[PDB]
Design a protein around this ligand. Structure first.
Ligand code: NA
Ligand code: NA
Lengths: 217, 218
């Protein structure tokens, strides 16, 4: 029961929330269970920073106060999921299309806690595609540049990010040097951000399985 | 000699490179706007234009010049645009007008980048004019902190929103000793969309208007 696993991972992250903290909140189904857990201790936290408009709506619907990242000097914790994560804390993210604000909030946060069920853990990144956020008028050009990097880009038809851009989901990229790959995507004109998380690692990786939650990192 | 007269000379110099049935990439700004009026005179000989800004699109369309989306173009032989600074190498600082992101995209699809300037845009060394950096709005504070670590002084361009919905940090005092590495260092910052350093995509020709005429600096 994957939902039961995701709930266990979510509950394990709650043990890191200290009184009066501002908490950064990711996106996706595992994070959404965490939001319900956060709701039960919302009297203990100052506020949350949301990594997507969807996440903001869910927090507000719970009566969890939300503040703008530009107003936050100190963000001690960011809790988020991942599409793939390894023992090093490298991740592929962006399955849900929110990877740009995810990476921004993750970079302000001191501690990045990654919560996953067992199926997200991999020994080698790469089977899950890399979502690349792209200025819409640059889509064709960026696709061509990503092909030169050995990727196979697939336009996520109909989808528009929180930032008004499109997503190319990129298959078959090599992850031999993940930080160089992340950089090579981002320097392409028109690329806003990409789902390789190799320069900003998860600090903790909480992995929920039938036997409990294990700190992979 | 008006500044306007100089920009017009540069605009007319660029028209000499336009061939029948081309798709033409078009930049932004007051010098390019004189080029748009030169293009209107030959619009029948043009296939269409690619516009680097919504303002440029509106000016092209008001001249009856056909506009097409960049995603429908693969063969873009020319891109004509100005610069805030340009040197003899064809390196440029761009983005004073806030449209540097679409400017760089179109310039990168185009085969030949023709830079048209009056003589006041030419510098021996880039750097006095600030570098516009386009930033995801909720990342403004973070990006500013990261730029300060790179040795820059970022100033938020109050009230301004780019064509893409983002804000501009105009950055002073960056070092240009390694301008390509500078351009990259800004862009790998999470939340930075693009920046006005044009060091990896050079101008292929630099047409400089002065009282004496137009000189191909490059
Ligand atoms: Na880019
Ligand atoms: Na970036």
């Amino acid at each position: 029961h994957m939902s039961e696993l995701k709930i266990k991972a979510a509950k394990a992250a709650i043990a890191y929330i200290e009184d009066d903290m501002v908490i950064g909140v990711g996106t996706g189904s595992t994070v959404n269970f965490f939001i319900k857990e956060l709701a039960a201790i919302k009297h203990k936290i100052e506020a949350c920073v949301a990594s997507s408009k969807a996440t903001e709506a869910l927090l507000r619907a719970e009566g969890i106060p939300v503040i703008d990242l530009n107003s936050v000097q100190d963000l001690p914790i960011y809790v988020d999921g991942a599409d793939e994560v390894n023992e090093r804390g490298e991740m592929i993210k962006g399955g849900g299309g929110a990877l740009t604000r995810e990476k921004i909030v993750a970079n302000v946060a001191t501690q990045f806690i990654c919560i996953v069920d067992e199926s997200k853990v991999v020994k080698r990144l790469g089977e899950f595609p890399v979502a690349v956020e792209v200025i819409p008028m640059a889509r064709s050009f960026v696709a061509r540049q990503i092909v030169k990097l050995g990727g196979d880009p697939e336009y996520r038809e109909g989808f528009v990010t929180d930032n008004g851009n499109i997503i190319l989901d990129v298959f078959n990229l090599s992850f031999s040097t993940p930080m160089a790959l992340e950089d090579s995507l981002n320097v392409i004109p028109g690329v806003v951000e990409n789902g390789v998380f190799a320069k900003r690692l998860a600090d903790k990786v909480l992995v929920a399985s039938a036997s409990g939650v294990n700190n992979l990192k």
